[PDB]
């Protein structure tokens, strides 16, 4: 089930941001399914080698998740990062320094 990088079917990062930000603003507490979908999206960018968008998504989520400051969002972001780190190492052995 290989797709081009899409989130809820949104490939365009603009539309993705619209989704992420709406999610993080309207939803006070992320559901594991949503979190895993963000996970699968980040890893999807890795496989499709579009680290450009990946970098942008990561930083964008940082902005939103940490502006909401709550541990559920903070841990969520870190959790996603872990996936990205490990998967990048599996694939290219080259990770992105997320700070």
């Amino acid at each position: 089930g290989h797709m081009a990088p899409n989130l809820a079917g949104a490939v365009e990062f603009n539309d993705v941001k619209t989704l992420l930000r709406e999610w993080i603003t309207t939803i006070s507490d992320p559901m594991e399914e949503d979190i895993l979908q963000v996970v699968k999206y980040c890893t999807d960018l890795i496989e499709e080698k579009d680290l450009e968008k990946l970098d942008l998504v990561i930083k964008y989520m940082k902005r939103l998740m940490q502006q909401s400051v709550e541990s559920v969002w903070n841990m969520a972001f870190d959790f996603i990062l872990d996936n990205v780190q490990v998967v990048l190492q599996q694939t290219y052995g080259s990770t992105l320094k997320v700070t």
């Binding site: 809820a8 079917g9 989704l19 559901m31 949503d34 979908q37 963000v38």
Partner: peptide
């Protein structure tokens, strides 16, 4: 119910494209 509690599930479902 009809849609899940997942935001993205909802979004994927509402996009009947």
């Amino acid at each position: 119910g009809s849609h899940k509690k997942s935001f993205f599930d909802k979004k994927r479902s509402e996009r009947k494209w």
